[PDB]
Design a protein around this ligand. Sequence first.
Ligand code: UQ9
Ligand code: SF4
Lengths: 315, 96, 62, 54, 117, 173, 107, 67, 188, 182
Amino acid sequence: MFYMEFILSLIGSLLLIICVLVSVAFLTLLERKVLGYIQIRKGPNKVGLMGIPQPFCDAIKLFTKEQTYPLLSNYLSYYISPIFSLFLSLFVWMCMPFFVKLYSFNLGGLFFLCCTSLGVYTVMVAGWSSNSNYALLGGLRAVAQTISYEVSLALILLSFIFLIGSYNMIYFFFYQVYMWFLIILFPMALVWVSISLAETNRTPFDFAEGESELVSGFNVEYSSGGFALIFMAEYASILFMSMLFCVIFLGCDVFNLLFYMKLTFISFVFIWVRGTLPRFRYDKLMYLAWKCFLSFSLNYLLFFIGFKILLFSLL
Amino acid sequence: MIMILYWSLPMILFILGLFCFVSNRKHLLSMLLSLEFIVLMLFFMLFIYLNMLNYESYFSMMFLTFSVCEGALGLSILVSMIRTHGNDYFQSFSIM
Amino acid sequence: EPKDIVEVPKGYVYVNNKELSMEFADITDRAASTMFFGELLRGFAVTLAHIFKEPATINYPF
Amino acid sequence: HPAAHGVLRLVLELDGETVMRADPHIGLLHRGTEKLIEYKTYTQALPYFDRLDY
Amino acid sequence: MFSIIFIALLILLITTIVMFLASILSKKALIDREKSSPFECGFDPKSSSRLPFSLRFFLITIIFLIFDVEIALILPMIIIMKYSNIMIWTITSIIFILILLIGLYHEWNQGMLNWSN
Amino acid sequence: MIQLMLYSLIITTSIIFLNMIHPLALGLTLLIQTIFVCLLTGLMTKSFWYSYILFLIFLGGMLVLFIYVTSLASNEMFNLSMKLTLFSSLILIFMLILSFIMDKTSSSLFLMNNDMQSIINMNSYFMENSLSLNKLYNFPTNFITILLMNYLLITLIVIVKITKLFKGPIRMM
Amino acid sequence: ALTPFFWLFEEREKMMEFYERVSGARMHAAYIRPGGVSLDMPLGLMDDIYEFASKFAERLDEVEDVLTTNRIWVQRTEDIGIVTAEEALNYGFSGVMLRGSGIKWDL
Amino acid sequence: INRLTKLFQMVREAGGLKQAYLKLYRNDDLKIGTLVGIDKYGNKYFENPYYFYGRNRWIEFAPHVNM
Amino acid sequence: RFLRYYAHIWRRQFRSMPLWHKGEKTVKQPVYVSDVAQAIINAAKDPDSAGRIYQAVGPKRYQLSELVDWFHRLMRKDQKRWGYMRYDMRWDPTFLLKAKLNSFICPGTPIGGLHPARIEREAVTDKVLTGVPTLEDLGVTLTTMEQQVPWELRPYRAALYYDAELGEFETPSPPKCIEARDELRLFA
Amino acid sequence: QQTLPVAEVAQNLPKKGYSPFGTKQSSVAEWSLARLDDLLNWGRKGSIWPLTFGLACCAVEMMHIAAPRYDMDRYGVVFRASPRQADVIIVAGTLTNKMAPALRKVYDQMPEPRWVISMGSCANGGGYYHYSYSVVRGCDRIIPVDIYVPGCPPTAEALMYGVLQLQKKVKRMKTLQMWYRK
Ligand SMILES: COC1=C(OC)C(=O)C(C/C=C(\C)CC/C=C(\C)CC/C=C(\C)CC/C=C(\C)CC/C=C(\C)CC/C=C(/C)CC/C=C(\C)CC/C=C(\C)CCC=C(C)C)=C(C)C1=O
Ligand code: SF4
């Protein structure tokens, strides 16, 4: 009865947690193979059998390796920031729509907006806590990212929301039963991927890491334990944001198998782009968000305010 | 009393907000930090009263809009502070 | 084709010499790519194409 | 730093991210090549030039 | 909510256990005065990271606070479209988005969106 | 029940907040409290719509002041206060003890949750936030929203004029 | 950008077989000498030099497609590091730095 | 489209899935080639022009080594 | 395991320092390790030094209370701000439990060098015999603690993230050695 | 030099087995540690992360090991920038005096267990500039070295062979099995 109900909710979260945690390990392998094939390389192929156990073969090393205690760092902050980076990455999954109920989440769309914003503090605190010049530049390079994508992100979500009528993610299924919103929203799909990259701090928007501009960005002063969680928390973001693209533009048939064939493909796209584009320039992004994306997104609210109004009169 | 069982806690929190807004901290930002602390508590009470009404919580948005502007304006004045004094310390201002 | 800003002598090649046309037929063509990620599109076709090649790796030491 | 090619030491004067002054500290790869050449026959000195502009 | 809080705590405990395993599973060696020194490309650092870091997007930084608080007023739109008067809802919404665009284009034309130079 | 424990934590975090000196210590204290107040407000309401909004609004303000803290008050100090840790921990457990032995039907707030409403209330069967946010965009209160718009846009003109971007960056000279 | 590094260093690997095949070292051939080169080319090298050259145009086109017209690539390079012609001469500049700014000079 | 027919063949000279797996586990690849010769120490040398130049000639190490 | 055994987190109790008798009945003659190593080698180069006993002690004698105060001044861990304070180890039994627990739990090596065997080393006062040769007989020139310790504890300093201006931390006062006569009175 | 076994003699030798400790442990506790010691070594062996030092003209041949022809990444070797996450350092080039304090520090910042590879003659023994007035005569003067890869520059395969030697050296560590005896 009701007492039993919440037990199942625990199982689902734990089941979803271990499954996501496992997948991000295998995603990292997939990233190396695919990125190893776009480049004419072969990719990890020796370890174990045909390279499949590679990511596990790395999780051993990052945990048998010593913690680093930076001399000039506020140790408690430096030590805790990895936890909340991983926690916020996993926690945002509880809003992922299931028809076999996991959590109701009316206003689920907002819950996305709150959680994704939090992911910046963990980078921000980690960089400042490390107390290294590069780490601080990485942190403040990450914050400036939020100032850019944050506002445009909400508006673009609002456009999708107008189509469905509510902030509950479940309704995306019903409206994408005949077709896919990709057709109606092609430029937004293309724009949305672009902002999605900023969310997860990937090439061409890789500024928090800032590899080859900063030595390793805000991660420059992390090691075995802390660095691992920072890494996993990174790829959990990709996996979710890839899924959130599949529920919005690609049917949202969560109970069908193909939905998971789609989910991996969008994950491939994220790796695919990393092997194509050079990194933007730190300012060109912020100009891009405010000069083009923000103006672009507002323009279609009118287009969808008119379209919904026009459609309302007929129906 | 009703006011003690339901409205005491937010008020006690509010006055603690003010006592932050007046205590002696070197940096002007310490005032801004405590500024939106108080606003957070004002929202809490205002949200108690608005919910005594069945459907009037929409006014929360009205309050939040003025909350950010005073913070946003409060932050602008700090910027103008820097580019005349060079620093925001309270003890750097002429005591008058 | 647009013209060259600087006339070219013999035995020399210029890299950025052609000017930009201002005919609507061309501005729209530039605009369309600038507006639908057209330049990046062919960049993505090329990289994906390399998935379908034999990688040049050697199975050292065998 | 990876972009420095393991030799360069730019002592930048950063006003935020913008650079106001750059001091290219050089000599991290000074191997007194031109003094060794003074001790070597012409043929023995030919390999030294493979190393310059490697 | 109360379900979510419980799982929020349960996850936080789980992730916390992960480093508490890492901190013990980690190889332990004597810490050196140089091992814990900061990383700044192998040369000692001139400047603490806690010096004042100049800012150039300060103006955008403030504008970001504003533009969000208008996101609080567009989000409710959808929820109240079936229930509101269409003229009032239509008129007000438009003159909400035109006001935003006009504000943006005004500053863009004034060059405030550009960074300090 | 957790409402009382939320009362204890918001009190506890407020006591320490009075004693913070380092700006980031203030910020961390404030950020933690913004979570609780956001959580607490949704308990006594028909929906958490406003907690989402409030949380989102303040997080915008949280980032910006770090950017200025990291530029103005970058070099400052912390001091663990054994008086403070004991005092908060002492009262915190003390307060938590009461919440277990409290007549927590009496401590619950009389504000009507969505379930607290009757079954006959026909207006409670619509969308979660339809009616409440409704007259924000209907005659005559809509003009208030319009008034904000100018107020916000006119604000946007105030910051650029106070700021005077062209006369340089900001440094803690 | 990463792929151009690998798409080109694959051709670079083929090219340093010709160094290895005439001199015996993939790098630092020590082949050119004051009296002329130190050995004749191996029999049949020139056929393989042709074979590499015949295919090298395609390799450079693919990198060009991904880089030259890329919108991001232009922004990361355009108007960054301008060298006016009169500045360059005074500086002892040479090579592409000299011809980058329009001077028609090639030793 | 028809690599399976090659794949089944690789198994047959391998000696069934059991010996095929150990081959894959050891050499990290399954390749068809003609035994050119056998050295004094048991290493078997294969060749197949089908593959491109670098991978054209390969060696099987003696079984007793095993890693 | 001497300048770290007193700077470690385990040795403290949240800011404190349980010392036997507050360390005021313990007198020590610590010697810099390099001087000891020099003694070993010098004894190796010489055959005259064979078959004899040598005592390797520093140049000065300090009360254990006096030393630990000086470290925490060097480490910027002064009582005024940091909150350092000295128990008497006999008063608190919690500390002895920590060692007993610490020894048992750790399989490889005690953490913070803390274990009951190490405690007894601290309590016992150095007893340099008269008439046994010292390293000065071997030609070693002993380094004083004031020369070396202030550089040993630089990486253990508290609030090391500060970037202090010059003069914002005042140079600590040196420790006061214990005169030979004073040791008679100190021990009654 | 110990020559390899003849085929007929080798035709009798038993299969080597994976672990270099064999399965001949007397007790359960020893045997479990031995197997558990393999698990560590299998981990560290698999993913060896160089630091991207790249000092001098060995550095170029340290790029071609990552090039598609040889593909260091096939072996789990992944280049990294920060010395904190880096596990191995490949000192490839001429370590001059001006650099020497910088290498020492960068090596120190690397967390244990850290292995060093010396590439080319320059980093091995000073190489072609052995007698120069501003060259450290081999990096082993400054940091411990675990593998020496000769060459000038070492061929790409030569370095690959060096890396595999480091995997085998890692594979046979006795970090746990020696704790038991300790
Ligand atoms: C040379 O030029 C070049 C450069 O210039 C320098 C480059 O920078 C680069 C840069 C390359 C990149 C940026 C590539 C992307 C790679 C990175 C950013 C980092 C490298 C690391 C990886 C790819 C590995 C990915 C994985 C991780 C880092 C760890 C993540 C955490 C994981 C996998 C753990 C998951 C958790 C789980 C519970 C999974 C299931 C269980 C386990 C792991 C348990 C394991 C074992 C046990 C518990 C033992 C139990 C035993 C018993 C009971 C007996 C290249 C390619 C280059 O060519
Ligand atoms: S060893 Fe040879 S190839 Fe390597 S850096 Fe020195 S001169 Fe160059």
